Amino acid sequence: IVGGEDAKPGQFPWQVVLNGKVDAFCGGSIVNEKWIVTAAHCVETGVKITVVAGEHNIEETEHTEQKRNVIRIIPHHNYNAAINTYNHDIALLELDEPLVLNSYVTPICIADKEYTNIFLKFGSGYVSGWGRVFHKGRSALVLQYLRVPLVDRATCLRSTKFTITNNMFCAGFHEGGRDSCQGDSGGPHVTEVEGTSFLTGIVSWGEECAMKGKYGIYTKVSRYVNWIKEKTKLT
Amino acid sequence: CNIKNGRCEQFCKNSADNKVVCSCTEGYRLAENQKSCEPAVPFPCGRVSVS
Ligand SMILES: *C[C@@](*)(O)[C@H](CCCNC(N)=[NH2+])NC(=O)[C@@H]1CCCN1C(=O)[C@H](N)Cc1ccccc1
Numbered sequence: 001i002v003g004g005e006d007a008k009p010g011q012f013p014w015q016v017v018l019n020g021k022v023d024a025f026c027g028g029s030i031v032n033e034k035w036i037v038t039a040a041h042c043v044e045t046g047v048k049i050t051v052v053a054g055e056h057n058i059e060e061t062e063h064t065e066q067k068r069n070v071i072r073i074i075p076h077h078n079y080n081a082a083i084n085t086y087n088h089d090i091a092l093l094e095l096d097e098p099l100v101l102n103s104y105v106t107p108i109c110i111a112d113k114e115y116t117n118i119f120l121k122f123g124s125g126y127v128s129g130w131g132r133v134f135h136k137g138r139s140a141l142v143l144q145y146l147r148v149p150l151v152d153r154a155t156c157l158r159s160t161k162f163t164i165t166n167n168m169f170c171a172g173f174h175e176g177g178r179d180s181c182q183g184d185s186g187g188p189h190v191t192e193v194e195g196t197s198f199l200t201g202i203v204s205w206g207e208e209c210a211m212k213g214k215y216g217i218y219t220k221v222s223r224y225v226n227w228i229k230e231k232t233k234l235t
Numbered sequence: 236c237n238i239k240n241g242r243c244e245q246f247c248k249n250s251a252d253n254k255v256v257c258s259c260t261e262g263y264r265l266a267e268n269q270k271s272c273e274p275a276v277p278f279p280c281g282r283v284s285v286s
């Protein structure tokens with residue numbers, strides 16, 4: 001996260017970090033005790049991945065961390081149908097052992113297609129992660145977060161020569177300076193509805209970070225809500 | 236549901252009579268005022284409880 005600030009412990013209890021061949025390489029959010037939702041481009045290959053919930057400072061011990069293994073990975077079925085577009089950039093991770101829910105480990109809410117879109121159109125969401133704090137810079141030790149405004153589709157489109165699909169939205173500031181960045185992918189874009197946060201996006205891609213005239217590109221979760229609820233059912 | 240979500244805290248749907256039926260997401264219960272949403276579990280989704 002560029003131009004954000006330190007979260008407080010438990011401020012984003014749905015946030016998780018992904019560790020693997022690279023440490024702290026992407027984020028994710030808790031769907032329920034057994035399932036994480038993240039970005040598909042974080043979890044290509046069948047490489048072993050670990051999840052840490054209740055994480056705050058990745059170099060220290062807070063005694064709130066819960067580490068789990070990923071036993072199953074379901075990228076969206078249409079991800080990488082078209083090469084290098086990052087359309088459908090969303091994936092689900094099944095944990096080997098259920099998370100124990102507490103003040104530091106809490107699911108994010110997921111509304112239906114209609115209300116997810118309504119909440120997105122509130123025009124203001126929070127994004128968080130342990131990604132780069134400067135472009136081609138250092139990764140964060142303490143969890144960062146940033147409020148980012150929604151950008152209208154027409155402006156979004158003209159901001160980049162790459163394709164923006166209806167499964168994506170733009171968010172960021174017209175003057176730049178504040179943005180998600182490398183390492184933040186899979187992290188939740190959440191909208192707070194009277195004290196209750198709902199998942200409205202996933203950090204996906206961009207062109208550099210925090211540059212003026214450019215915006216962060218996010219997976220539009222409203223389009224995948226039915227898919228998420230179908231795949232993550234607890235029995 | 237036209238104005239302010241039919242004063243529903245979370246979800247709203249049009250019944251009839253120009254009336255409103257409110258509802259909440261999983262982990263929450265419809266409060267007896269038939270508008271607000273109350274936690275029905277120890278750690279409901281989307282809430283900060285670290286205090
Ligand atoms: C995987 C995520 O950590 C990362 C998040 C980047 C978010 N950027 C901003 N400004 N909010 N996503 C990616 O790295 C994705 C997938 C792989 C490539 N990619 C990019 O964002 C590249 N920057 C896309 C690109 C732009 C210009 C030229 C080539 C590639």
Ligand SMILES: [Ca+2]
Pocket residue numbers: 055056057058059060061062065
């Ligand atoms: Ca720690």
